[PDB]
């Protein structure tokens, strides 16, 4: 039962990156103030916080596996921290422009990042951050990158040029391309993680969301309500619902099945840029980050 | 710049 309950909420600059830790009550974000900040949601005490840099940190995830979390900035550099220590792992130059978006591979030592400079890195963690691969043919910004969950062998960015692109590693062109339709670009791709549907989602500026079967390249649907630029849209991991949030401010849960809006929130923090699940589904938690802070919620 | 913020 959709029963929404406010966790635990605080406010801070712009968060543009957001993350939860698997096996720990904890959310990272990372701020357009070049700080990073780690919260026990339910002790609602910081665990851990850094001033990284004095340019925005758009990206940022959990790398549980190591205990460290992996950051990028506008100052062109991925940055890796351990987050029981605050020691810097490692920090190098990843593009020579902004970077929009990091994705972190499940069971190998892969990192992807995502930049304005219109490509796609991976890099190799037991191969001292080495850079692996570089994939070229996007012609703007490409503003998200995530593995298919079903197969991480398997990747898709999203980018400003109205594509998504789909990859292989060790492949150095896409699988193939879905033209969106998108016409005023592509800010967010994601896939639905379960077996039963070959479904990707794309979020646009253009005022739309939509759902992809990435076996035929056919849009299923498309969704509209929210009011101005689309910064996200996922699927819940184990909830039939999916999630967005918009620089109109407000966060849609629509109903997967159907399509249609179930709820529509404004949690008071202005606009929203960015969003997090949590990976195996615990209280349906889900977080995103806004202009003004950032909330964690249940969802029931 | 697009998408500064």
């Known amino acids: 039962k959709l029963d929404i309950k406010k966790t635990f909420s605080n406010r801070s600059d712009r968060v543009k990156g957001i993350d939860f830790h698997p096996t720990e009550p904890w959310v990272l974000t990372t701020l357009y103030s070049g700080r990073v900040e780690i919260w026990n949601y339910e002790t609602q005490v910081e665990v851990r916080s850094i001033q990284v840099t004095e340019t925005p940190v758009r990206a940022g995830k959990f790398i549980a596996r190591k205990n460290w979390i992996i950051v990028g900035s506008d100052d062109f550099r991925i940055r890796v921290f351990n987050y029981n220590t605050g020691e810097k792992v490692v920090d190098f130059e990843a593009h020579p422009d902004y970077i929009r978006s990091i994705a972190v591979h499940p069971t190998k030592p892969y990192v992807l990042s995502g930049s304005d400079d219109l490509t796609v890195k991976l890099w190799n963690w037991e191969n001292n951050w080495a850079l692996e691969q570089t994939f070229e043919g996007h012609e703007h910004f490409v503003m998200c990158v995530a593995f298919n969950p079903k197969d991480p062998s398997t990747f898709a960015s999203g980018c400003l040029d109205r594509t998504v692109k789909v990859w292989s590693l060790g492949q150095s062109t896409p699988n193939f391309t879905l033209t969106t339709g998108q016409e005023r670009g592509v800010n967010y791709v994601d896939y639905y993680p379960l077996p039963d549907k070959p479904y990707m989602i794309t979020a646009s500026d253009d005022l739309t969301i939509k759902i992809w079967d990435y076996q035929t390249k056919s849009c299923v649907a498309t969704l509209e309500g929210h009011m101005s630029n689309v910064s996200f849209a996922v699927f819940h991991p184990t909830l039939p619902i999916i999630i967005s949030g918009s620089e109109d401010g407000t966060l849609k849960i629509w109903n997967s099945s159907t399509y249609k809006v179930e709820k529509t929130l404004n949690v008071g923090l202005e606009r929203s840029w960015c969003i997090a699940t949590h990976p195996t589904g615990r209280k349906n938690y889900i977080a995103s980050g806004f202009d003004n802070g950032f909330t964690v919620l249940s969802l029931g | ?5």
Request: charged share 40%; net charge neutral.
């Open chain 2, 1 to 5: 710049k697009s998408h500064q913020e």
